[PDB]
Amino acid sequence: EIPLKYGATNEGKRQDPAMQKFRDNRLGAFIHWGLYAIPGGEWNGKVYGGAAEWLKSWAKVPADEWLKLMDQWNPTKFDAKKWAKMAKEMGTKYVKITTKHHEGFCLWPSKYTKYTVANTPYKRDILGELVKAYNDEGIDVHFYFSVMDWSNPDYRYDIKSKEDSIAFSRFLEFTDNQLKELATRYPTVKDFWFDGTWDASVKKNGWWTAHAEQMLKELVPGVAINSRLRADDKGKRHFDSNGRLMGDYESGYERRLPDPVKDLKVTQWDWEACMTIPENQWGYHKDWSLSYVKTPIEVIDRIVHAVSMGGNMVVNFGPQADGDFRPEEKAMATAIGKWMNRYGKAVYACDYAGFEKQDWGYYTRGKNDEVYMVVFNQPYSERLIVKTPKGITVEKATLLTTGEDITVVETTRNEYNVSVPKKNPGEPYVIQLKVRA
Numbered sequence: 001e002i003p004l005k006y007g008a009t010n011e012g013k014r015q016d017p018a019m020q021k022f023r024d025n026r027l028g029a030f031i032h033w034g035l036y037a038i039p040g041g042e043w044n045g046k047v048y049g050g051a052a053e054w055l056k057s058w059a060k061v062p063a064d065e066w067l068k069l070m071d072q073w074n075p076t077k078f079d080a081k082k083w084a085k086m087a088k089e090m091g092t093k094y095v096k097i098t099t100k101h102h103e104g105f106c107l108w109p110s111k112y113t114k115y116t117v118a119n120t121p122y123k124r125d126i127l128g129e130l131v132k133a134y135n136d137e138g139i140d141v142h143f144y145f146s147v148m149d150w151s152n153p154d155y156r157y158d159i160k161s162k163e164d165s166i167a168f169s170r171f172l173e174f175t176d177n178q179l180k181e182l183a184t185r186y187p188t189v190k191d192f193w194f195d196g197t198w199d200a201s202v203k204k205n206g207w208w209t210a211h212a213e214q215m216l217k218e219l220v221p222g223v224a225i226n227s228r229l230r231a232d233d234k235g236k237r238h239f240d241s242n243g244r245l246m247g248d249y250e251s252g253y254e255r256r257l258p259d260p261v262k263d264l265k266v267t268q269w270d271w272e273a274c275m276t277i278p279e280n281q282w283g284y285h286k287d288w289s290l291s292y293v294k295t296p297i298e299v300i301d302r303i304v305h306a307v308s309m310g311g312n313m314v315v316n317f318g319p320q321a322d323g324d325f326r327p328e329e330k331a332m333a334t335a336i337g338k339w340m341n342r343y344g345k346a347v348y349a350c351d352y353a354g355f356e357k358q359d360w361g362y363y364t365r366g367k368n369d370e371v372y373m374v375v376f377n378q379p380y381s382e383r384l385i386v387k388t389p390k391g392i393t394v395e396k397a398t399l400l401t402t403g404e405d406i407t408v409v410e411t412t413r414n415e416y417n418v419s420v421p422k423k424n425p426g427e428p429y430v431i432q433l434k435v436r437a
């Protein structure tokens, strides 16, 4: 195999208690909040279809003019405690927060740039307030951090000269300064989730991504670091040139979850999917009619899908410029929350069950060999087919919400019909299996 100084560090899955916690959490929320919430995808009376947090790009807005949006940053309805309560009611165990998105505006009063919350009418340390409020509810906080920074002239998209190399070096020192600052100001952070690391400039500096991961693990014991940060000696990203995952989990699947039949390889490493409610809006966008908006069951389906394949799922929110959430997002949080309250035993601290996928829905495995059937598609046959692996027998089936016994009929070796419940639950539901050796 290829000689590497900056390839994969972990052999298989980390199993220290912090990584176990990161994994067992399973369901998180994402917060994309930045200057982009003010225009909300509209620039000079025109609504753009592109992702709102990218509006500076779509509308060709110079750095100086975009960043003047700071003068309007005054989220008067913001209440960190109420944000924390919303997250708790939704059943999220963690929240990932945009500390600085591509635009380069910091949600914490960084010492290293003037483009921060400190220099707006609101003045207050938003990041600090959220970290405390979430933590007070027993919710872990993860930091989103964009390496790419449209506010800083030293950023480069590629290195094709000594000049680029010198500027980028300065940029990387500035970046390191911000990272160490976050890590030491907010020592309860559990994860750094890097974004804007896809450029050729970053690929040519694999050494730096490995140093950034080491630097943070040294500052925050047990911290998690995503694969999206990492490039190796050859510029190959996420997985090194020997095929081994870099960082602590694979971060991806924003557009496409792993196929439950063809993508079983993913069960071999920790991973996390983040998802938007509309097709592709992360930051606040004023017009959600421009693309398909996922219903609660469609989101729940994805959450279970991820867990059923040994992955976490994170649901994105784009708070309004006033510091409140749109009613579509409040409804989603509440609907997920109701369902999680009923059926979350099949999600929290669950993993890949090792069973062949069936059409009615998903399996998840509890930590102590509970096998949960999560039914999204109710069979007219009134029979849920279960094909067990070699050695496995189904001893009992129980409806999760009521404890009622569910009929199990053996149909052939390694195959059973689990009866649907006597009364249709009328929403996606869970049947718990007692299995044996």
Ligand SMILES: C[C@@H]1O[C@@H](Oc2ccc([N+](=O)[O-])cc2)[C@@H](O)[C@H](O)[C@@H]1O
Binding pocket: 032, 051, 053, 054, 195, 196, 252, 253, 254, 255, 256, 274, 282
């Ligand atoms: C979470 C998102 O991350 C990136 O956009 C991406 C990056 C990767 C994928 N992806 O590989 O599916 C999709 C959107 C960002 O540019 C962005 O605006 C948002 O923060």
